[PDB]
Design a protein around this ligand. Structure first.
Ligand code: MET
Ligand SMILES: [Mg+2]
Length: 364
């Protein structure tokens, strides 16, 4: 006998460039917690249902997990764009959802069954602008790009734009694109002609990487900040050597000294031969929230005897009250399921000159 937890992430489509790291983190969590006896002796079982890259796919994944797989709760989805459409399905069904990396404004507000372990754009994004200004205090003109078809990108770019204004910088242009675009010559040239010292991009991985590369191809030599959608080594293949120098804020640091992060990091590093990326840590933390909440609930009210609808409701109630020592640091939730997290960072992409390999270097 095992306790089913649903994992609804992008395992196909271009969104899987972001989902990949999350699936990896979730699998590491499953082994980590089951090796510790699962929920008071009862193993958990992660049940994966691919969301693909759109809303319909996420709705279908949630409904399958809820109705066929009878999961006690869901971790997912990958994108805020997907969460806004699909999470209300779980809310109405009274099934908890914990978002691992949905950072758009308004996610926890979707309902009483929606929480997230991922700090939102308003708290993560401004640090990368401050970091850019530290590396070049003479930055004055800023060009901003964003994917207008993506909910998170629209949310993130508003934060970036306000931060630019508050830092006393000149916003010379705001350019729009679609996440499905591969070509950005017109927008990139429009920005370059305005001589920005800093470019900020809010998109996803393939699009963001393509835009970074094209900006460099077209001769742009200034600073570049990428938003959370570019926060994966999967961009390295796209912009290659031209990814070098891109600043990306982080809601996770491998060097954080919590015991579980040490164990998570070591488990990750030993397998993947590189530092755990943010999306992997965040997915681990989401599974952790479910395991530790299930343990706490089971101790007070043996879960093997609770019928599924009540189990879901009590698990949701429980997880909202918990304090968790996760790879992300010590976290908890507000009464509406917003994450409470103290520490944030900025990393910078460092490419090898050949362009075949790179890493994220954390700024001190
Ligand atoms: C794992 S990709 C997440 C991208 C962005 N944080 C969003 O909310 O969609
Ligand atoms: Mg909520």
């Amino acid at each position: 006998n095992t306790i089913p937890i649903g994992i609804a992430l992008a395992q196909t489509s271009n969104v899987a460039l972001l989902g990949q790291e999350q699936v990896a983190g979730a699998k590491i969590a499953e082994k980590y917690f089951n090796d510790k006896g699962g929920v008071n002796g009862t193993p958990i079982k992660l049940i994966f249902q691919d969301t693909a890259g759109d809303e319909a796919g996420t709705i279908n994944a949630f409904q399958t997990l809820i109705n066929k797989d009878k999961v006690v709760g869901i971790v997912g989805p990958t994108l805020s764009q997907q969460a806004f459409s699909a999470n209300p399905i779980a809310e109405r069904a009274k099934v908890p959802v914990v978002g691992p990396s949905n950072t758009a404004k308004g996610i926890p507000e979707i309902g009483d069954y929606v929480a997230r372990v991922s700090a939102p754009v308003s708290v993560v994004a401004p640090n990368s602008v401050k970091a850019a200004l530290k590396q070049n205090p003479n930055i004055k003109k800023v060009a901003v790009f964003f994917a207008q078809n993506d909910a998170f990108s629209k949310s993130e770019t508003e934060i970036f734009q306000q931060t630019v204004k508050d830092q006393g910088l000149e916003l010379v242009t705001v350019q729009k694109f679609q996440t499905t675009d591969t070509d950005f010559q017109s927008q990139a040239t429009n920005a370059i002609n305005l001589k920005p010292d800093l470019v900020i991009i809010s998109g996803l991985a393939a699009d963001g990487g393509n835009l970074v590369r094209q900006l460099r191809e077209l001769g742009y030599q200034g600073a570049i900040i990428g938003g959370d959608g570019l926060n994966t080594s999967n961009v390295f293949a796209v912009c290659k050597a031209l990814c070098d120098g891109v600043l990306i804020a982080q809601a996770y640091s491998p060097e954080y000294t919590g015991e579980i992060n040490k164990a998570f990091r070591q488990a990750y590093v030993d397998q993947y031969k590189k530092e755990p990326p943010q999306f992997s840590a965040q997915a681990f933390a989401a599974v952790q929230v479910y395991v530790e909440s299930l343990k706490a609930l089971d101790t007070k009210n043996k879960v093997s005897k609770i019928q599924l609808p009540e189990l879901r409701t009590e698990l949701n109630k429980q997880l909202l009250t918990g304090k968790y020592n996760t790879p992300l640091g010590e976290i908890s939730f507000t009464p509406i399921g917003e994450v409470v997290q103290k520490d944030f960072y900025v990393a910078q992409i460092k490419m090898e000159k050949d362009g075949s390999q790179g890493k994220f270097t954390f700024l001190k």
